């Protein structure tokens, strides 16, 4: 599949901009609650994505009635 | 005047779970202003996201051959 | 707020290529019905916008290491 | 590249209203075009959200008047 050095390798291809996470991964359960971390991250971060955009129309939408 | 009910009321319509935007709009300099920081987490916020799952698909695999 | 002509130039102005709404808007019940239709294709696209997203992410992973 | 298996439990994981798509693989341009088909769609709907996000402004501020 991938060990850590070609997974942080297709990090920095995939994000240029970011540094690889370095997670502990010592055992299967460490696997599954970084997976879990991961899961309830990517729950938080679609809400704030949405919210956000929300914003932006609304913002857009005001400087037009105001353009 | 320039009064929010309907973004108000919107904003607690999808996520009744966050703080109401406290935004300086009083000016189109700051609305402006706003819509750029709006932009600039959308953009973060939304490349955080994908690092996230990526970091779950690289997990999720990591952990089918160890199971 | 705003009526009619701005909401038509808003739209316009975010959104050049579609046309604005048609919407039959006559009294209360009309704009419920509406807002419920809206919040319900608001939630049924961000979830393809989700899936859609962690396709395209998947797909360009494979295309790192492969 | 981190590969299946766990691909699918990411997608049954993150979403559960779908079934994963069976995507065709079986080379490089395979991917492509899927990924090709993928930021269409993500263009598409993010223009189709912010559509309705829109009118749900107007909506909202129509309806909090006359009800």
Redesign the interface.
């Given at each position: 599949?991938?060990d850590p050095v070609?997974?942080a390798?297709?990090?920095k291809?995939?994000?240029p901009?970011?540094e690889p996470?370095r997670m502990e991964?010592r055992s299967?359960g460490d696997?599954?609650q970084?997976?879990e971390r991961?899961?309830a991250?990517?729950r938080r971060?679609?809400?704030?994505?949405?919210?956000?955009?929300?914003?932006?129309?609304?913002?857009?939408?005001?400087?037009?009635?105001?353009?």
């Open positions: 599949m991938v070609g997974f390798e297709a990090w291809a995939q994000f901009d970011s996470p991964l299967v696997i599954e970084e997976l991961a899961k991250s990517i971060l679609e809400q704030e994505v949405n919210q956000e955009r929300f914003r932006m129309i609304y913002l857009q939408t005001l400087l037009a009635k105001e353009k």
